[PDB]
DNA sequence: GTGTGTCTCAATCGTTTTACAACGTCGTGCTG
């Protein structure tokens, strides 16, 4: 719960890792390590992931370093001090029995706009999709123009 | 070390009387008005403000090293130089230098930083038609009582007319855009308060315009 | 010194946890991909296989067998479909925040666009979507519609509700 | 989820434009062929991504509005998130972010708190976001992305969604810190042995 | 004249000897996704000999189930059906062929180029999702493209080699005269006179070499500039009328503008051909922060402007309408409809029914699941 | 006056902006209009920037106002009309040397690429304005029309662009010898104009003319002692005198460069 | 009740590293 409140030392080390090295003086530096390790080793807060564990590891090692440095400084001082439509087309074809060519399936389909343009091209795209999924076997290379036979 | 010393003397003596005995030392800091360090620039602007507050008789020959800072790249020098122009404007009485305050203010209506375009307006507002006295509320102009005609509104009124008389098409547009931007103020009360002051002005000029029906070529214009 | 040895223990346990997390997340995303892709097409197999390292997206557009159909030799439409299946499965395993889609209807057909629309309906039930198109299939699923217009050298945004699904399709 | 956005001064967006508190489910945007969609998504990416970083003078000027009204100096985008606990500072139920850009300044922020860049980077990193080119965002016509890249990059994206890159980075950094401490500890031991003798 | 037939066996996803039929003016490829519908453009690009990397594949064994070949037949406005056949021999090599006689690339490319088909710089082709990156690349490669259309690359090689010869000669002669003024300036001893005589003769030799090299340079530069200036002059006078024809919709009867500028009028190869465009309701911005639709329109206008210089016999378009609304796709459809003639053959692949709904011939492509052979049919749009 | 007032409607949103911002900053609670102007300038551009060099001040000043507006709104490609700004930078009265510098310092602040080499082209225009035949001998000391150009670009660490423009001026300084016999008086009068424009300009550094003197000694070495046995021999041609006079103009400048800063030794 | 004296927020002036763009180096794919 270290993100929410300031109870556990996990919150303090989280602040140390999250914000910066500062805003944690000597008087609040002297915290615990074993508690922090046994708090990170168990399952973390509301985000169940690993990223927060990585940040916490950075924080604990930074605190470790700073405390060791302070100990070094004190020891140096102590030394100094002691030194002293695809359906609509599928339906028309589903009904009509084999054999049937394209010209005739077009003949029984009249698009609402009356143009032998969009009706025909939509009919064509349609028979393409139908042939694309196992409806019709077709044949056109017999050197006869517009001679596609269409059969289930 | 040069930064520290001029930073120290900015509050050290609290008496510009040292410069009553050392005008050559004052001449030293006048030379550093164009240093590259943006920090030392404002220090010169602060010291030179203080020197006018007491040793007032140096309005003209000092004035030059003041407006030379408003057209500078740093914001600190501009945001400081402006506030000194405020104090100088009241203590001075030559209208011919008052107009030079205004032209250099309106020119900085827009700037690269937003805050310069912010401060520049209220410091202008504070001068032109927002006096700081009594008898400024709940009344109109009347006939030559309490000597407000030639002693109060002559700072509220006079430097206007000589700034709006420029036939240059820049002046006639730089003003009118600024006035509307001044209207959208901080909205504690935004309309009625500014009204009362300028309704006085709009009637005040009007009294001098009632002179046109009680009377001269350029004056009317 | 005791603090030092404890943080060494911490590094070890966290490394172990990382490795098990990698394994389980790979397994889950693989299963999710296979399910979504078999849902999209009436007949096909899709699966991911990690290489021998610690990936190769063996796609197949048929049911019986592949003919070593090498990726980026298939089509534009098929690989666009594969990319969408990938991101949608990754988000199915773990909910991602506020995903955004700019003109996914590029080289698809009617049927694929309808199947995209239905699965993105379900994914909208689970998470947050914003997208842009021009076609009638993606439009019928948002239940919250917008609109932009450009006039006087400025672009403005508005909010409209029904007219767009008949005005900017047909 | 995220509720409403304000953009002003941005490219093809002069004045003060706000979008409604949009719905948490699917949303669509429709308009003309060349107006204000790619710019909208570019603004959303601008406020929250790793892009527009290695900019320059003409770049940090390229993304302002150039028009006849008046020379514009700065621009800002601000988003509003209605989180519950996904973002770590759960004390704030409605977090807000904004990034202002002048011709010679940029500042990230939090709820009017003007923090530096590294902190908002760390904030978005603790949340479930990704710093680099994010998979959940696809720009114009770039949809054929994660189907033709080199497959080691696909392993990279998978290790990204599992969250391990930053883990390795901080682990190595911690190792460096450990080396500094091991030298300092050797010093400490020698000095205290001298103490003990004296 | 135009493309007439294509007979191909065992191409990628085409098993058996298929025959692709009549190609009238402005034919349209059509079919569902993922089944044919661009292997035809691929086979055209393979006949028109090109590297595999521009195609979707990355080798030459990967287009098959045995060794294959593509054979194209072309008309030359005088009845002659000249055929070009390119095969793939085992182990990965290849053999080109014209009229069933084995011929190396040289005469292939030559007798192909004589019909205004530049293959070293392919321009008549466009690939899926590459229309908008024709007007957005740096200016140096646009200059490279227009220069490849000029056909002056040996001129470029002689140019830059001669420039290296000529900075070398001039800087060496500069330091040479520096040392001469140095040495002779101290003269007032055999040392200075040997230095005089030998350095003078050395500098005279370097001078003769420099003068000769200047001549060679002036020759190659004169030829290169003749060709480049001819090309640029004829192209940069024709882009704005066709751009205004492209972008003048009924909504905006003042379409827009387009400019091709360069920095040094005398030495143009340094700064690339900068190119900018202005849609109807828009101010001046460079080709970087422009959007997708205007990028597409500008690229198509640029290609048509190229076509105004040297006409190509055919023109193959893939999905050029990826990011366009209805207005301008209807506009470009009307343009292509009223511009195709005996000199131009537009073969267009697209899905939007409004676009190809008014073609002359259609080639639809299906995929029989039994053989996985993406077979195809074709039909006319004249009886209706 | 009609054209300028027409364009002014789009720019009148400067205080009509605040007339509208009184409903925008403080909110209330055929589509040709935007595209009539941006076309009818390009159909009449090539006369606009020709009028600016006339002696009729009212005509001129009321031409430069239009040019001040077009670039400010960006209605025509600035690339086509940038080669006339520099020709208005110096060769006029003082009343216009402000605005030209202002536009020339506006584009270089935020565009930097649409204008980077055009100086080489535009310098042909200035020399094309003033006539020089047996008169107006380009003696050193005059106001070089780029006196401000180097200043405006040098307001940064421009270790590159400062070098770029001077390259665009020295383009005829070296003698490429496009055809060694054929050079005309106006053609070498051109290069003599380019000499003085390099002379009278101060610099922030000292290194950049040291390569310039390195170039002029090359042409001194390369082609000079060719004609050395020509002038002294019966002088009956114009091939050399159209060049040798030009060649001896280089020692003039090179001598002025040794005194340009009095720091070069030889 | 008025001056106090201490705590907390904003610009700016050297460093630093860090992204970026130019330049040889190989290795696969062909064609003669
Ligand atoms: N810096 C800019 N300032 C103003 N407008 C811009 C800027 N950059 C691009 N634009 C304009 O923004 C529009 C782009 O809108 P976009 O959303 O890109 O169009 P599409 O609808 O194709 O996505 C174009 O008109 C473009 O010119
Ligand atoms: N060498 C090959 N042998 C058999 N099939 C192939 C071969 N190479 C590619 N394919 C298949 O051919 C089909 C390509 O069809 P294409 O015409 O490329 O699709 P699009 O409709 O996007 O143009 C894909 O299924 C691809 O996998
Ligand atoms: F690859 Be093909 F154009 F669909
Ligand atoms: F129309 Be945007 F560029 F997708």
Residue numbers in the entry:
A (entry chain B): 5 to 88, 552 to 619
B (entry chain D): 795 to 1009, 1016 to 1021
C (entry chain C): 996 to 1049, 1078 to 1193
D (entry chain C): 2 to 199
E (entry chain A): 2 to 65, 84 to 207, 1031 to 1226
F (entry chain D): 1248 to 1276, 1293 to 1529
Q: What does the article say, verbatim?
A:
Among the SMC complexes, cohesin establishes cohesion between replicated sister chromatids, which forms the basis for faithful chromosome segregation during cell division. A characteristic feature of cohesin is its ability to bind DNA by topological embrace, which underpins sister chromatid cohesion (Haering et al., 2008). The cohesin ring consists of three core components: two SMCs and a kleisin subunit. Mis4Scc2/NIPBL is known as the cohesin loader.
We assembled cohesin onto a linear 125-bp dsDNA substrate in the presence of Mis4-Ssl3 and ADP·BeF3– and separated the gripping reaction by sucrose gradient centrifugation. We visualized this cohesin loading intermediate by cryo-electron microscopy (cryo-EM) at an average resolution of 3.9 Å. The model covers the Psm1 head and proximal coiled coil bound to the Rad21 C terminus, the Psm3 head and neck bound by the Rad21 N-terminal domain, as well as Mis4 and 32 bp of DNA. The DNA lies on top of the engaged ATPase heads, which are nucleotide bound and in a configuration competent for ATP hydrolysis. Mis4 clamps the DNA onto the ATPase heads, making widespread contacts with Psm1 and Psm3. The U-shaped Mis4 hook binds the engaged Psm1-Psm3 ATPase heads, whereas the Mis4 N-terminal handle contacts the Psm3 neck region. Mis4 and Psm3 together form a protein ring that topologically encircles the DNA. The lumen of the ring is lined with positive charges mainly clustered on the Mis4 surface. Although the U-shaped Mis4 hook can be superimposed with a root-mean-square deviation (RMSD) of only 1.0 Å, the angle at which the N-terminal handle emerges is tilted by 40°. The cryo-EM map was of sufficient quality to build amino acids 5–12 of the Rad21 N-tail, forming a loop wedged between the Psm3 ATPase head and the DNA.
